[PDB]
Amino acid sequence: AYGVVHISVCNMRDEGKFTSGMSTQALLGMPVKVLQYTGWYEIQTPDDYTGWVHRMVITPMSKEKYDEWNRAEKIVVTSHYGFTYEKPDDDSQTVSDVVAGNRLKWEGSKGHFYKVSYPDGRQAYISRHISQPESKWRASLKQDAESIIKTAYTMIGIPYLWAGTSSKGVDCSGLVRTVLFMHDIIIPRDASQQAYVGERIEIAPDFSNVQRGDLVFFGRKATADRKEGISHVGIYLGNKRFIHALGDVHISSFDPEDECYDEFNTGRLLFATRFLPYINKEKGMNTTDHNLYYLHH
Amino acid sequence: AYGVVHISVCNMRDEGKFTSGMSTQALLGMPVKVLQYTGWYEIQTPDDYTGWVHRMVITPMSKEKYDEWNRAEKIVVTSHYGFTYEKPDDDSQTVSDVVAGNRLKWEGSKGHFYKVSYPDGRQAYISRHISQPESKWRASLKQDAESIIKTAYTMIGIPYLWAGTSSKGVDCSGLVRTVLFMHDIIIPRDASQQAYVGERIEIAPDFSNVQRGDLVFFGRKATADRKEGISHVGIYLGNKRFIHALGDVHISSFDPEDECYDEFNTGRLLFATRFLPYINKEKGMNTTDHNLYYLHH
Numbered sequence: 067a068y069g070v071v072h073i074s075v076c077n078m079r080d081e082g083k084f085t086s087g088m089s090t091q092a093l094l095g096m097p098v099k100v101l102q103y104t105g106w107y108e109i110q111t112p113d114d115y116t117g118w119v120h121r122m123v124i125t126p127m128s129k130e131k132y133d134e135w136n137r138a139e140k141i142v143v144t145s146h147y148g149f150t151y152e153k154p155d156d157d158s159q160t161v162s163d164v165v166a167g168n169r170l171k172w173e174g175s176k177g178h179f180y181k182v183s184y185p186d187g188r189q190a191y192i193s194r195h196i197s198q199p200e201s202k203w204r205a206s207l208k209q210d211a212e213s214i215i216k217t218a219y220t221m222i223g224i225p226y227l228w229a230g231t232s233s234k235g236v237d238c239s240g241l242v243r244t245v246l247f248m249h250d251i252i253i254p255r256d257a258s259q260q261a262y263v264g265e266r267i268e269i270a271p272d273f274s275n276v277q278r279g280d281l282v283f284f285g286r287k288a289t290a291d292r293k294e295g296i297s298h299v300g301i302y303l304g305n306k307r308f309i310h311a312l313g314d315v316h317i318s319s320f321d322p323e324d325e326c327y328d329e330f331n332t333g334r335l336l337f338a339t340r341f342l343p344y345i346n347k348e349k350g351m352n353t354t355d356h357n358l359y360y361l362h363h
Numbered sequence: 364a365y366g367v368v369h370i371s372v373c374n375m376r377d378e379g380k381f382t383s384g385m386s387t388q389a390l391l392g393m394p395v396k397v398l399q400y401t402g403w404y405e406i407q408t409p410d411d412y413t414g415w416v417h418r419m420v421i422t423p424m425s426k427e428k429y430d431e432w433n434r435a436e437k438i439v440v441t442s443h444y445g446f447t448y449e450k451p452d453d454d455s456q457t458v459s460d461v462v463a464g465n466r467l468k469w470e471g472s473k474g475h476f477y478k479v480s481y482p483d484g485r486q487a488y489i490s491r492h493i494s495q496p497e498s499k500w501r502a503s504l505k506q507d508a509e510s511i512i513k514t515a516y517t518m519i520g521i522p523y524l525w526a527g528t529s530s531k532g533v534d535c536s537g538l539v540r541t542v543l544f545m546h547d548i549i550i551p552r553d554a555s556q557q558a559y560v561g562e563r564i565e566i567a568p569d570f571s572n573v574q575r576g577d578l579v580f581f582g583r584k585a586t587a588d589r590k591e592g593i594s595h596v597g598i599y600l601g602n603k604r605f606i607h608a609l610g611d612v613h614i615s616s617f618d619p620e621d622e623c624y625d626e627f628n629t630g631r632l633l634f635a636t637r638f639l640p641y642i643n644k645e646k647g648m649n650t651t652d653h654n655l656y657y658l659h660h
C-alpha cells in the first residue's frame with residue numbers, strides 16, 4: 067500500500083506498459099501511495115496525481131517502514147545534476163545520478179561528503195557541494211517570488227519534455243512544479259488544475275496589476291456556449307515577460323518590440339494567478355513538511 | 364531538407380504530437396535529414412531512424428549551411444552532465460544544459476573555457492573540464508571492449524527511460540547507443556536491428572566463447588513455425604555478468620551463485636554478437652567521421 071521512489075527520476079505512465087504515454091514523474095526518496103499491482107505499480111504522488119511505473123523503480127514498504135523513511139533526516143539534492151559514489155571520493159565508482167529534489171536518508175559524514183542510503187538499501191556518498199541536510203536546507207529556504215524566479219532562470223535552455231517533472235526535462239506545468247519543489251512547494255500537476263488555485267487576476271491591458279512570480283495561463287477564451295480551456299502556463303517576470311517551457315525553457319514577451327516576443331501565446335493569454343501567498347492555506351498547495359504523504363496520519 | 368538539433372536532447376516520437384509515444388532521441392549539434400513538415404518535423408538521425416519533433420527544437424538549414432555546420436571543428440561534451448554559460452564564469456547565467464555526445468561549433472577560448480555557438484545562433488562558454496576539441500578528442504579515443512565497458516560503468520544507476528538515448532536516461536538498446544556514441548560509434552537504434560550486425564556467437568554452456576564487450580540478446584527462441592523475437596539487450600562483462608537497462612542501469616548475472624542473478628533474462632538468453640571489430644566494415648555500423656550524414660556527398 068506504500069512505496070518510496072528509489073531512482074533519480076521515475077516515469078509514471080497512463081497505463082502499466084512502456085507503450086503508453088508518460089503522464090508525470092516522481093523523484094528519488096519521494097513517498098508514494100501504491101494503489102494496485104499488475105506487474106506494474108499504480109502509484110499516487112504527494113500532488114494526488116496517479117500513474118503507472120515498472121515494479122523495479124519503487125521500494126514497497128509497510129506503513130511502519132514508510133513512516134520511518136519519512137521521519138529520517140534527509141540529505142536534499144540542491145544542484146540540478148550530479149552523482150553519488152561508493153566512496154567519499156568523486157573519482158570512485160558511481161551508485162546513481164541525482165537531480166535537484168532527490169532526497170536520501172542521512173547516514174553520516176566523511177570529508178566533504180555526506181554518507182547516504184537509498185530506499186532500496188544501497189549506501190553511497192554525496193558531495194556537500196551539490197546537497198545539504200534537510201534541517202539546514204529548510205531553515206535557509208526562501209519561498210518569495212524573487213527566490214522562485216532566480217531558480218527558474220537556472221533552468222534556461224533545459225529541454226521541453228512531455229510530462230517532464232525534473233531538472234532533466236520539463237513540460238509547461240512541469241517547469242512550475244520543478245522550480246517550486248526546489249523551494250519545498252507542491253501545487254497540482256496539470257496546468258488545468260494550477261489555473262484554479264490561488265487568486266485569479268484579470269489582466270489589465272498594460273499588465274500593471276500582474277506581479278513577478280504570478281502564473282500566466284493561455285488557451286481558449288470562455289464563450290457564452292463554452293467554458294475556457296487551459297492549454298499552457300508560464301511564470302511572470304514583470305515588464306511583459308514570462309519564462310516557460312516550449313521546445314526548451316526560455317524567456318518570452320507580450321511586447322512586439324522585444325526579440326523574444328511570443329505572438330501565438332500573446333494572442334491566447336487568458337489570465338494570471340497569484341499563488342505564492344497561499345501555500346498551506348488552500349487545498350492542493352502545500353510544503354512537504356505540511357503534506358500528509360510525508361507525515362504519519 | 365536538412366536540420367541540426369539545437370537542444371541538449373530532443374524527443375523523437377512515432378507521430379507529430381506529444382500524445383504519441385517517444386521512439387528515440389537526438390543530441391545537440393547532431394545533423395539530421397528533414398523528411399517532412401506538418402507543424403512538426405519528421406526527421407532522420409545518422410542511424411537511419413525516423414521520428415517526429417516539435418518545430419522549435421531543430422534548426423532547418425540549406426544543404427550549404429548544413430555542410431558548413433558539419434565541417435566546423437566542434438567542442439565535444441565528454442562529461443555526462445553540465446551547463447554552458449553566457450560568460451567564461453560558471454557563476455554567470457546559463458545558456459543550456461549539455462549531456463555527453465553534445466557537439467557545438469568551436470568559436471575560441473577564454474580562461475578554462477571554450478567559446479561555442481549553437482546551430483540556432485546562441486553563443487556560450489563551456490568548461491574545459493567537461494568537454495574537449497573534436498580533433499584532440501578523436502586522436503585520444505579508444506574503441507576497444509575495455510574502453511566501452513569503462514564508459515558503461517560510469518552509467519550505473521541511471522534511470523531506464525523508454526526510447527531514452529542519452530546520459531539523462533536510457534532504454535536497453537539506448538544504453539548501448541549512448542555508451543558507443545561517447546566513443547564516436549553509431550550502430551542501429553532498435554535491439555532487433557542490433558542483433559543482426561557483427562558476428563553472431565552461439566553461446567557455449569560455460570560462456571567460454573563469449574568475450575567482454577560482446578552484446579547479449581534476449582527474447583523468444585526460434586520455433587519451426589515462428590522466427591526468433593528480440594525483446595532485450597545487454598553488454599557482456601565476462602565472468603557470466605552483463606550490464607543493462609531495466610528499471611535502471613545495473614549489473615546482472617547468468618550464474619545463480621551470484622546475488623545479482625537475473626533469472627527471467629537468463630532463461631530468455633538467445634545469443635551474443637561481436638560487433639566492435641566491424642565498425643566501418645559493415646553497413647549500419649560506423650564512426651561519425653565515416654557517416655554520410657556528417658559529410659558532404
Ligand SMILES: [Cl-]
Nearest residue numbers: 226227228374
Ligand atoms: Cl517532448
Ligand SMILES: [Cl-]
Nearest residue numbers: 077523524525
Ligand atoms: Cl520508462
